Design a protein around this ligand. Structure first.
Ligand SMILES: Nc1ncnc2c1ncn2[C@@H]1O[C@H](COP(=O)(O)OP(=O)(O)O)[C@@H](O)[C@H]1O
Length: 277
């Protein structure tokens, strides 16, 4: 009987259990994400502050329900305190330090693969529980440590969304209509995989067009040493039509992804280019 705990919105002042500092781990939509310390254990953690409101509690739940996944940043616990006469939602997160995906990179095809593989997993799990991130951009991919074995994790559920309301032989369609399709998630993947391998994004900067038109290239030299197999994989991800685009399940099985170990240590110009513009 495997069961994890349900989420609990703590009401006591976060200050008693934690020690909040002025350091800024970073900025964004909701504001500053401060670095905090756990008194009794003295470990560092990220603190996110949301206005308490229905939409917010939904996000938090989704993320908390997905923290059981290795490659998703974990929510240690959440508070509902009173901030400025305003009822807020304080979220404590494991503190990722390694830095954003591309940074670490700039600062082998096989490595690019392995990276794609973990991002894939972050998505496979979310989807396997009916959730679409819908904001899988590089920025939201931080490394745990600076160490060489740091692990990659996806974060930010400000747009996370439930795709499911309300017979061994029945088709997935019949199971019911679930919209908000995660396809974009698979698109974000292509973009990322692209950038990794060469150092720049597929669609450059009438860009909104080149996209809708779905017109890009694997410019030489950059892609001169890249397999048509790897190339073919980007294409099925970069399909302009959702329903035509590859599935997360089909991605995790594609050879390049499923067998990183056995993938060419062919160098990539990435860092260089990545640093050039
Ligand atoms: N758990 C974390 N560990 C380390 N840094 C974080 C963490 N969460 C957020 N950050 C920093 O704060 C910024 C805000 O991140 P994000 O989760 O995307 O929230 P939002 O997009 O709503 O601003 C990130 O770009 C990052 O630099």
């Amino acid at each position: 009987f495997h069961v994890k705990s349900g989420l609990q919105i703590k009401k006591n002042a976060i200050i008693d259990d934690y020690k909040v500092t002025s350091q800024v781990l970073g900025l964004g939509i909701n504001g500053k994400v401060l670095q905090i310390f756990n008194k009794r254990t003295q470990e560092k953690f990220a603190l996110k502050m949301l206005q308490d409101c229905p939409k917010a509690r939904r996000e938090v739940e989704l993320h908390w329900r997905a923290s059981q996944c290795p490659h998703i940043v974990r929510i240690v616990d959440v508070y509902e305190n009173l901030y400025a006469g305003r009822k807020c939602l304080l979220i404590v997160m494991e503190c990722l330090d390694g830095g954003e995906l591309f940074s670490r990179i700039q600062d082998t095809e096989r490595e690019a693969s392995e990276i794609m593989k973990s991002i894939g997993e972050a998505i496979q799990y979310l989807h396997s529980i009916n959730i679409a991130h819908r904001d899988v951009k590089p920025e939201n991919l931080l490394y745990t440590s600076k160490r060489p074995n740091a692990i990659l994790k996806l974060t930010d559920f400000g747009f996370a969304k439930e795709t499911t309301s309300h017979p061994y032989y029945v088709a997935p369609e019949v199971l019911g209509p679930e919209k908000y399709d995660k396809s974009c998630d698979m698109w974000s993947l292509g973009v990322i995989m692209y950038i990794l391998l060469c150092g720049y994004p597929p669609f450059y900067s009438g860009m909104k067009t080149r996209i809708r038109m779905g017109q890009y290239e694997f410019p030489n030299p950059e892609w001169s040493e890249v397999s048509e197999e790897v190339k073919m994989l980007i294409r099925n991800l970069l399909k302009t039509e959702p329903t035509q685009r590859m599935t997360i399940t089909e991605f995790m099985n594609h050879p390049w992804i499923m067998q990183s170990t056995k993938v060419p240590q062919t160098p990539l110009h990435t860092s260089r280019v990545l640093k050039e513009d």
